[PDB]
Design a protein around this nucleic acid. Structure first.
Length: 73
RNA sequence: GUGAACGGUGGAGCAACACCUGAAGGAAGGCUUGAUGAGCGUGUUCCCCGCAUACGCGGGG
């Protein structure tokens, strides 16, 4: 680990304003009047997962030419 | 088929209200635009310096 570990927050939110605009315009056929950030399509979820800058070292028995071909891909 | 693959940090919110840079403080004390340079004496061959190279030229008092 070249750096100390950090944590990345990412969120999943469905655009509530765009959902209401599409629901009036008819492009979204949603019969539901009220959304729910708790659960459902409009669940604004938060999830935090670790992040590391590092150098990755692995050891294996294989032909170098194919391994360098795959790793250059 | 990378414990992978998928995943918006988002929406809203006035740095604003009031506040004298001001009071006092001498540019003065002394100083001729007046002169200065404008006119007033010597009466004939005597030293010394260069170009020459003496046939003579310039020249110090």
């Amino acid at each position: 680990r070249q750096l100390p570990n950090q944590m990345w927050m990412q969120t999943g939110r469905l655009s509530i304003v765009e959902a209401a605009r599409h629901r009036q315009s008819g492009y979204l056929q949603l019969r539901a009047g009220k959304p729910n950030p708790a659960g459902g399509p409009f669940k604004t979820s938060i999830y935090h997962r670790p992040i590391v800058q590092a150098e990755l070292t692995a050891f294996c028995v294989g032909d170098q030419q194919g391994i360098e071909a795959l790793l250059s891909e």
